[PDB]
Structure formats: C-alpha cells, structure tokens
Amino acid sequence: AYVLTETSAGYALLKASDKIYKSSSLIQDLDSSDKVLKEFKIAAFSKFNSAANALEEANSIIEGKVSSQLEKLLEEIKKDKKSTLIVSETKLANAINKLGLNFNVVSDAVTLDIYRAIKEYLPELLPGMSDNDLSKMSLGLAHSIGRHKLKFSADKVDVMIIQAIALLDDLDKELNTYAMRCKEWYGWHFPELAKIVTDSVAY
Amino acid sequence: KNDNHIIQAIALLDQLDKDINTFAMRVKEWYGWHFPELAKLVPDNYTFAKLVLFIKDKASLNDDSLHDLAALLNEDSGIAQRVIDNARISMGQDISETDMENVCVFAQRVAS
Amino acid sequence: NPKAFPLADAALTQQILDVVQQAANLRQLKKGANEATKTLNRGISEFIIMAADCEPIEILLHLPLLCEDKNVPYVFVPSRVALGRACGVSRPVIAASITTNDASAIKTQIYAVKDKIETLL
Amino acid sequence: MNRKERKSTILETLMGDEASNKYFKRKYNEIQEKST
Amino acid sequence: KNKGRISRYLANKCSMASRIDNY
Amino acid sequence: TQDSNYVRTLRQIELKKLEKGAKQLMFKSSGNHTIFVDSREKMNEFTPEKFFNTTSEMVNRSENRLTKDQLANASSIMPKESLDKKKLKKFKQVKQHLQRETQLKQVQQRMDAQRELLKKGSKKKIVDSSGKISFKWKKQRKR
Amino acid sequence: KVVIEPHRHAGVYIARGKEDLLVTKNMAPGESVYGEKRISVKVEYRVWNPFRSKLAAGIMGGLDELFIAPGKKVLYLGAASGTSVSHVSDVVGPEGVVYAVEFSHRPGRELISMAKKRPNIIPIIEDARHPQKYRMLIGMVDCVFADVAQPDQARIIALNSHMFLKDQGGVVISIKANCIDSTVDAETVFAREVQKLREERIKPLEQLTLEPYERDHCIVVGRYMRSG
Amino acid sequence: ALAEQIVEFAAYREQLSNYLSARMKAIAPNLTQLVGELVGARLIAHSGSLISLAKSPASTIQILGAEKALFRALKTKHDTPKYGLLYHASLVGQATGKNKGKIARVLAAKAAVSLRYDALAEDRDDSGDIGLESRAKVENRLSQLEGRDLRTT
RNA sequence: GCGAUGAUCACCCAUGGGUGGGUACAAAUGGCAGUCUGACAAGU
Hints:
This is part of a larger assembly, with 2 copies of chain A, 2 copies of chain B, 1 copy of chain C (121 residues), 1 copy of chain D (36 residues), 1 copy of chain F (143 residues) and 1 copy of chain G (228 residues). Chain A is 52% helix and 11% strand. With 203 residues, chain A is of the alpha/beta class. Chain A is elongated. With 112 residues, chain B is an all-alpha fold. The longest helix of chain B has 29 residues, at 4-32.
C-alpha cells in the first residue's frame, strides 16, 4: 500500500506491507520508532522548487484541489491496473479517485497511527531525503500561508507610511542644517549672495 | 592663514558620520521589513547598503548571484551562501516596486 | 456570515427599543456613534445598540472591536430610522449607548436584557 | 555646572541647593517659633 | 599620575607647536 | 468652584494611574485546586507533602512549592520592618487612588445632574420619601 | 536591588524587589509586545499579567506539572492577539517551538506581527475545527493548550490531540461555564468536562478554579496516554 | 561636491514626497479625497495605527494635534483649542474664523466616518467615492456657511 | 649624563576587579501624560 504525506519540505510517498492491519500492528506494538520507520523508510519523494510564491500557491492547491506537482509525483505510482494509496483528506481522496491515473485511495481511515507515527519519527526520515532542519522551513511557509490567507494588499502598509513620513521629516531637517552649513561656508566668497538668496536648492 | 576650512571640515565630518549611521540604520529597517535576517547576517551598514543595492529582491538567487555577491566583499565569512539560504527560506514581507526603488535609491544615497 | 453580527429578531428588537425610549426618558441613553465611542473610552457605557442600514456598516463596525476590548456587549437594529424614532429625535441615529446609573428604577429591566443579550452572544 | 544637575528652573535649583535648604528650614523653624 | 604628567608635557609642546603654526 | 472639564481630566489621569498601579501589583491566589486520583487506597494515603515533594511552608505557599531537590531578603537594609512597609505602602497608595477616584466620580455625577437640570426640559420636581430629589421630564420628542 | 528567584518550573522566575512579581526572560530585548513593563537585572526580564493571561494566574494559582518546558514544543489554540503566546515563547526559548492558531482576522494580524518579531511563534491563521487543513504546517506537538471560547472544546481538543500530540502527551485547557452552559453550577460543569476528557481518553491529573483573578474559570491538566 | 550632495538630497526628497502621495492614495484613498495626503499621513503618524485612528472618536481627531493646549486648557479652565492638526488642510485654510471652527468640526466628523470606512473596508474598490461624496457634503456646508452673513443689510 | 622651551603638588578585598560618579550619541508600546461640548443652527 502507498501513503501520501505532506511536509514543509516536500511530498513523501511510502510503501507498506499489505494498510489498516499495518496501522493496527503499529498502534498495538508501539511503532513510533526508528525500527518501524526503517521497515517503511521511503518509497517515492519529491521536493518542490525554490519559489516562495509558488510553494504558497502549492499549499493552497493542497488545501483545495490537485496540482501539476502532484501529477509529476503521481506519473508512475501504479505497477498493475490496481494500486492502493492512503491519505488523510477526504476531499483530496475523492479528488485523486476522480484523477486520471484512477488508482484506488483510502480516505481518513484508522491510519492516524501511520500518519502520526511517521510524523513522530520523521527525524528518522530526514537522513533519507531532507538533510536539514524543517523548523525554519515550516516557519517561513506558515508565514507565507498566513500572509496569503489574510488579504494583504501589498500597497497598504501603515508602518511603512509612518516610517516614510518620519524619514521625510528627518530629510527636511537634515537638508535645512546642511543648507545652513554650505551657506555659511560659501559666505567666505559671497555673503551678499548668501543674504540675497534664500533657497537651499537655488544656493 | 585661514582656518575656518578646518573648522567646518571638523563640523561637517561629525554631522556626516552621524547622518551615515542614521540613514544606514534606516536602510537597515527598510530592508529588514523585506528581509530581517539580512540585518541579522551583515552588521556593517555600508556593505549592507551595497548588498541591498545588489540584492534589490531576495528572489533572484543564482550561481552567478553567488559569484558577484561573493565579489561583494568575500566568501570566507560565509555571508554569500548563508544569505542565499536565508533569502531562500526567508519569512520576510514582500513590498511593492515603488518601495523597492525607494530603498535602492536610499542605499545608493548612503553609499555616495 | 456577513459582518452584521448580532442582529436580533422582531420581538427582541422591539423590546430593546422600548428600553431605549425609557432610558432616553430617564436620560440614561447617549446618542451618536462618536459619542458612543466616547463613553466606551469613558467606561460608563453599559451596552451598545447599533444600526444595520447606515452609510456604510463600517463606521459603526468600529464599535464592536472596542466592545470586545472593554467587555461591554452590543447588538444591531435593522432600521436606523427606527433607532432614531426610539431615541425620540427627528434625525435617524445609527448608534446609541445605554449608560450606568445605580439609582435607576429601570435597572432590573436593563439587567434582564443583559441576561438575554449575553445568551444571544 | 553639571548635566545630572541641569534643571529647568532656578527655583528648582535653589531647592536642589542643600545649604540653602537647611538654612531655610532652620531660619523658618526659628521665625515660626517666634510667630507662634 | 604619570598619565597627567604626560598630558601636561604634551599640552606644553602642543602649545608651542600652535604658536609656531600660528605665526 | 470647579468644572466638568477639569474633573474629567483628573478622572482620566487617576484612572490611568490606577491602571498602571494595578498592573504593577501582585495578588496571592486562593482557589479550589483539586487533584484527581486513580485509586481509593492512594486517596487514603494521599499526602500533599509526598505529592508536591515539598516542605510545610512550601505547601502552604501555593506560589513557591519548590521540589526538595530544588531546595537542595537580607540583601536590602532593614528586612523585617522596612521592605514590608514599602510593599504595604504601595498597596495603600493604590487604595487611596481608588478612594479619590470614587469621590471624584461622585462630584462629576452631581455636576452633570445640575448641568442637565439647568440644560433642558419641561420638568416636574419630585421628592422621594427618603428625602431625595429627582426630576420627571415630560414625555416629548426633542427636535 | 532586585533578587531573582527561579520558580519550580524551568523558564519562569520571580522578582523580589520593591514589588513582588512573576517574571520570565525576554527574547526581543527592549520590546514590550502589548504594553507590559520590563526589568533589567544584567539580564532582561518581562513580567506576566494574570488578568490578561490566565496562564500566569494558573502557575500563580498552584500547578503541579506544567508540560511546557524549554526543550519542548507547544500548540496554542485560540491565540487571540498573542499576549500569552509571546510569554510561552519566552518560556520555551530557542530550543522550544510554539504553534499559535487563531481564526479571527485582526488578532491574526497582530499574531503575524508577533511572529515576525519572534521566530519561536509559528502562525496558523487556518481554522481550529479542521486540523487536516493545516496538517502540513504542524508536526507531532509535545503539549497542547486551549484558550478557545467554543462549546465543543473537549471535542476539538480530542481531534487536535489525536492528530497532533505525541503519545504520553500533555493537554491543558481553559474552560468557561459562562460560555458553555451559563445556567448550571461550575462544579458540575467541571465534572462533566472531566468526564468528556475521560471519554476522549485524556487522563486528567488535576484542575484549578481561577477565583481571585477571573470569575467562573477553570484550568485542567491531563496526560494523553495510549494513542497512536 | 557638497552642493552636489545638497541638490541630490533635494531631488530625492521631492521623489520621496511623490512616493508618499502614491502610498497614501494606495492606503486611504477616501482620506486623500477628503482632507489631503500630507495631513492624513500626519494623523496616521500621530495615532500610530490606522485601526487605532478608526478606534479614535471624532473629537480626538479634531484635537489630535494640539494635545498640549488641549490638556493645558482643560486643566486651567480656558478655551479648548479647536483646530489641532487639521488646520493645515486646504479647506480649513480656505475657511476663516468661526467658519474655520465649524468646518473643523464637520471635517473631523466626516473624516472619522470615511476613515472608518477606509480602515474597515475588507473589500474596497479604491475609487474615491466615499471621500468624494463626503467632500461634496463639506463643500455644500462651507458654501452655506459662507452665504450666511453677520451684518444686517 | 635634569629644569621656565616648566622642577614639585570614594570603598572593599593583595601592583587586579566590583561599587560610585562624570563625558557624547542612540532606542524605549519607559514616566511627566490626561484625548473638548453634544440638539439644535439659518431664512420666512
């Protein structure tokens, strides 16, 4: 059986010995550990690319639909005319039932055992495909998904406008004092010009 | 025998150093809104303004980008590879192109 | 789920407008959205009645936020013309505020609608 | 003079001056005893 | 102590140098 | 002598002073903490000393119930009489802010009563049998 | 001038100076996130407020086993405006990680600002009722805290604990009788929600009513045993 | 080279002011239709956040600028200041005297209304409709107040 | 192998540090510090 799994670093697919009885054996024999994750280490992995907006839209299509990254992961899963795969989303389950490769999928069944245990020993799956820490990855991806889930018109930023008007005031003050500086220094050659003109820019 | 050139030179150098650090920390704020880990990675304000001018946007991370941003001061401090990894996995807020041009012109102002 | 949060049914709306007239008669109700914000800042508004048919809902949607800040509940009326009529004034008020006064003979009524309003929220 | 003693009122620097303070309280107790 | 001595010494020498650079 | 504007300014002044003070203060807890035990024999031998692995004062103080392995005011001058006086002094200043705020609320309420009575209405002065004063406005829509 | 005393839980302390205070460390130095005052003793410390964060009132109210440690990970459900997720980020430090979840919009924006300030906070603007909608973002939490104001509190915590807690996990909940029943006694309310946690397999070790700081409020602390 | 620095500062400050006008039109377009980009950003900078300014009532917006004279005069029993920050709007500049006072009142109130719309409009077409219609309202009140005279004919 | 071009002139622990103080700059959602009134106005 297959297990499709979502992580902040990619899309991981696992083989298991034919499932529901494998989930049962996991939960009754306490298989949250490295031994069981080496019995089911990896079957088929895919990184998504290094584009933040693209991976944000990718998690949005994970929440809603099925995507082309899922196609290029799901191109050669089947060996015969019947292949089973376990997921935890029911709408995504029926979506990959009505998908073109038409392999049979199980919805959110009792394999919370499977998903919770391979998420517990996902640190053992990290020497498999993702030789890094996924904490800052989940940090950045969660920030991007929140940033999209709230509307976030990118032109309406109050801290930007307040920093901008503050810096406008600072540039006015600095222009005035450097104006006085260059005026008194150029008083060495032209005090009459310095008194008869008043504009810093014209000076 | 004139000496006010020396005097105004002292005064203008003092004011100039003060305005350098103020406008450079303002560059630091204006690009820490887009990438705060740049402000956590490179502490030098002058090289910060130059690095903002080069990395306008944190999306353009290429191997030639590694090369020219390593020609920007160095490789041995790990700044190039570390800032490419941090701008790849950055949580920084995206801004508009007018804000971007504003921040780059401000960093050019700091450099000049 | 629109932004028009709690809006009562017909009989409930009727009875709060009746406490609106009796508090306006006993001078226990203040008038206006800016004045309602003022007594919110004062800490003497006991609860808030607002409209739904204003230009637009937002200038009185600024009030529920401070309501949840200063734990002072609120509800909506469908007609601001009806709200100004229970206020007893020629112009349609869109936001009115029931204040606090310990020597008020209608306080049992206000604490009653307070129970009903909290069960609505 | 100072920075941590640079204060915005000469009355306030008179109260900061302690010899004037004890001089004032001494002569004040004196003349209030003379009054009472 | 000798820091102040060095300061006074350099103050006298810088006074003489200010004199010669002024006149 | 004084008006609603100045007393309202004072009201906001001292309410924000109360808010900062009550944010600064510290209140000891008193709750019905209950522990849920599996077995009735462990109920019968249940002792807070063994359960909290504490001491006597450590179990009477619900704040600092430190473990005995973690066990395993004299820095300030006059500890037994002056620091407690300072804490109790801060507490009394908060209480006095409360009292002056309520007295000032009474001033403001009487002044707004006189102001509204002078302001507007077709009024009928009613006396209530506790010696109290009130005014009944006639029922009329103001234009 | 101000003595610091380390409390029995790792990460929390007590300031004994002119005033007694319950304090924690700071992660953003010189940055009060909601207006509370900070002290320098030097190491920078920030005090907790019970009325603003009942979590501060619980450890002040007496708590046996608090499952939020420095080297741990905690989920926060009902993170309205973050005034407590900042403090739990301070108590877990860099080693720990807190996942704040909140549905509403403007406290969500405050929470994004606070997650910008603090990397220990991970933001989830996704709804708490469906955990599969954000199952990608959070992985195998050690302890969970609930401050949500919904009547299906033990049920939604049962979903989040089944899907997101590790075995032998920690479940700590704030429960409000005025929100769920508002007509019957607080004690039978708390007994009934204990029975609900027992039906949802949470084994409750203790509970504490929050009488001097709030009104008719309870915190419950329990272990999550025997789940896969 | 110093004069080069100066003219570069001046040109950059002019470009910055144009960028600020664009930013204010992007953030609060109805406030740009009502009171002005500069004074709107000044009210924003005083209040801090736009949500805080929407939380603030109308009298707070009217006397947001002269808080010193406000709290002073309320403390020592004098006339409360009546313009604050919004005096530098072109409308109050065009007004005169007690006309300035009444236009300050109605302009603070209308700016509070349309500012609340701008701050709490989750969807917003960014056209300028509410600011334009409220500005026409203030224009009509201004023309009525200017037509109302004081000396007997 | 001298000198007017200038001789000489707060604590604790044993030539080390802590306290205390003074000098310039920067930050504070640190304190001073508290956001006016509210139904009528104008012509007939």
